[PDB]
Symmetry: D2
Subunit: 140 residues, 4 copies
Amino acid sequence: ARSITMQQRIEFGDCDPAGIVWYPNYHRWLDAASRNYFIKCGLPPWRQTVVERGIVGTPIVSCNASFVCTASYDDVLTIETCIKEWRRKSFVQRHSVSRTTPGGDVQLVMRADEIRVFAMNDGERLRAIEVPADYIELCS
Amino acid sequence: ARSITMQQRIEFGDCDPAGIVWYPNYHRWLDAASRNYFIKCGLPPWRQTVVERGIVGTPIVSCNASFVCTASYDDVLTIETCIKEWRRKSFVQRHSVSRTTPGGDVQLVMRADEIRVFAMNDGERLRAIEVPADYIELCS
Amino acid sequence: ARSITMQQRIEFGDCDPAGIVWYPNYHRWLDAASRNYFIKCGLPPWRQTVVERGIVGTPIVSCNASFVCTASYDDVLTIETCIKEWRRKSFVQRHSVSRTTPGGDVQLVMRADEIRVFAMNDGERLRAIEVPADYIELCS
Amino acid sequence: ARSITMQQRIEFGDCDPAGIVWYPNYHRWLDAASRNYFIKCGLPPWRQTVVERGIVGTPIVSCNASFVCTASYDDVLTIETCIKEWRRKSFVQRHSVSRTTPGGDVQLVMRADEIRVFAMNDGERLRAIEVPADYIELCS
Ligand SMILES: CC(C)(COP(=O)(O)OP(=O)(O)OC[C@H]1O[C@@H](n2cnc3c(N)ncnc32)[C@H](O)[C@@H]1OP(=O)(O)O)[C@@H](O)C(=O)NCCC(=O)NCCSCC(=O)c1ccc(O)cc1
Ligand SMILES: CC(C)(COP(=O)(O)OP(=O)(O)OC[C@H]1O[C@@H](n2cnc3c(N)ncnc32)[C@H](O)[C@@H]1OP(=O)(O)O)[C@@H](O)C(=O)NCCC(=O)NCCSCC(=O)c1ccc(O)cc1
Ligand SMILES: CC(C)(COP(=O)(O)OP(=O)(O)OC[C@H]1O[C@@H](n2cnc3c(N)ncnc32)[C@H](O)[C@@H]1OP(=O)(O)O)[C@@H](O)C(=O)NCCC(=O)NCCSCC(=O)c1ccc(O)cc1
Ligand SMILES: CC(C)(COP(=O)(O)OP(=O)(O)OC[C@H]1O[C@@H](n2cnc3c(N)ncnc32)[C@H](O)[C@@H]1OP(=O)(O)O)[C@@H](O)C(=O)NCCC(=O)NCCSCC(=O)c1ccc(O)cc1
């Protein structure tokens, strides 16, 4: 499937007392990579979609993640994101995070399969919508 | 199993432009609840265990999370944490996050099953260890 | 002046590789204490004020902070917040952060004087407003 | 003085319910720009300096910041960092954050003068040291 890649440098503050990336940081990066995928695919920013069609973004409903090896500040991560499956109102977005050894060897760092949905805010109530056909086309 | 509960107030800054908790924040809270469980169970802080026995903490190796309903600033979350299963070097730590409606009704917000391990830092290399028997006893 | 106090526990993830609170975390806490002051003083949540009168919150325009001593996970901080001065469209909000030694001795950890304003979002443009008289009264 | 520049893209999660960058995020970026300055100037990473000479990094002792205009997700910030003054054990590190209008016009977003020190961890006690002469030379 159509894959988008992005890089992410790890900062000192992104690490814990144990000297490695504090895990919630990976989710911050996964969230940026998720949105980056759609922006690169041609969708407008949520600020615009909300005005146009009520779409506030793609909130997450489920996640399955695995942490394979550690990473630390100064490491440059490479994130590869694709849509694994289009369902009805949901979609599975896969992210593979790697880093390179000075050997030119690519090591898998972590991976996550996120299940998200396009949604609208009906007043205070979040509500999922069927995946827009036009969006599927842009992402194909 | 032995369950520990803790509360967490959601702050304005913990929310996104869509006005609800930005997901990585739940993982920050899950991480605090994970450690809180061990502290409440009687283990010493990692600062001390590292000196004593080399244990740096309990890094995460895998996670399965589901987001059931939204939450926003001023909501007070209740997190319930327990150890679901002791394996060899790993353990499954379950966290249930809820909030209360003014109806006195308890709504499930999110849940996560985290797989972690007790580990040591051998120089720059993180390494898992068999779950310490003494720790299993404190947590029982 | 009217002072509001709140507590904040420091978490493992709130610390850096150097084992102490990573500074941006203090600002997260200062922001929560700022809002907590207004909530405790009786103002409604911004979600409501925006609908009622267009007020989105109190964005920061300036800050002067000093870090006196370190803090780490498990330390319980005590934050004291007050309004130091009401200007025209701005106000100076002071925050004093301390922690206690087991000696019953209170140590100053950090302090910050924040300059904020009540504001509205005119479309995409943030705009400060004269401090509402009713708010000054609630905070007095 | 020797100035180092770096870019920073603002993400959806870096914004608050008011749709603009939540302030503590600027400090995260200022901290990365501070370290980036030293790395670019040729100092080794703190992981190495701590082993070699005990230097854990450059903790902050004071800060004076001003927020000039707002920024939001997708905006690309440009951060310019330099050392404004070398004192004895401390130094003043200035950071100027800007963004560009599609007009090719550069708008100042925020600025901060941070006062930091090179330090060591003597056991649990952080301690400032006289600025290393060799470091001053690398940064010149
Ligand atoms: C999102 C929603 C309102 C959807 O509920 P709904 O309108 O009643 O519709 P429905 O239940 O049919 O769910 C829609 C789809 O999700 C699927 N789904 C929902 N939960 C799950 C799950 N646990 N596992 C698998 N699929 C799921 C569901 O099966 C359906 O898929 P499909 O069969 O149509 O293909 C409800 O699940 C909910 O509120 N969950 C909480 C969402 C939440 O708070 N997530 C955490 C914070 S989100 C804030 C955030 O970080 C963010 C980031 C980026 C961005 O662009 C926007 C937000
Ligand atoms: C942790 C480790 C070094 C373990 O590798 P190892 O020493 O070679 O040993 P091993 O592979 O046998 O794994 C140990 C156990 O984990 C189990 N395990 C590992 N991966 C998985 C997985 N994906 N699913 C299920 N079980 C798993 C494995 O089966 C074994 O369990 P058991 O059968 O003995 O009961 C390696 O998996 C690794 O480095 N993963 C990356 C860890 C990481 O970077 N996590 C994200 C950041 S952690 C920083 C953090 O946020 C933190 C928070 C709190 C705290 O207290 C400490 C840190
Ligand atoms: C806020 C504003 C639109 C105000 O501009 P304005 O409408 O043209 O009005 P004006 O310039 O007269 O400023 C209003 C007042 O601020 C005072 N002020 C502004 N800058 C300064 C400064 N550097 N030092 C001292 N006073 C200042 C100004 O003198 C006046 O005070 P007063 O004499 O009326 O008492 C403009 O300064 C601006 O956009 N600054 C950037 C704001 C920003 O992006 N802050 C960082 C992110 S804010 C997101 C956030 O974290 C947040 C947290 C909590 C919350 O409830 C809301 C948001
Ligand atoms: C840092 C220190 C131990 C220094 O105390 P000290 O060893 O007794 O020495 P001393 O008081 O003489 O201070 C050293 C210098 O700082 C100057 N200084 C200290 N406070 C101030 C202040 N408020 N305003 C101006 N200058 C100041 C002081 O005048 C002297 O400068 P100089 O005249 O020698 O040029 C003490 O001030 C302290 O613990 N402050 C708290 C530090 C803290 O917790 N900061 C917040 C978290 S730091 C965690 C972090 O985010 C981080 C980020 C990056 C990195 O690489 C490392 C850490």
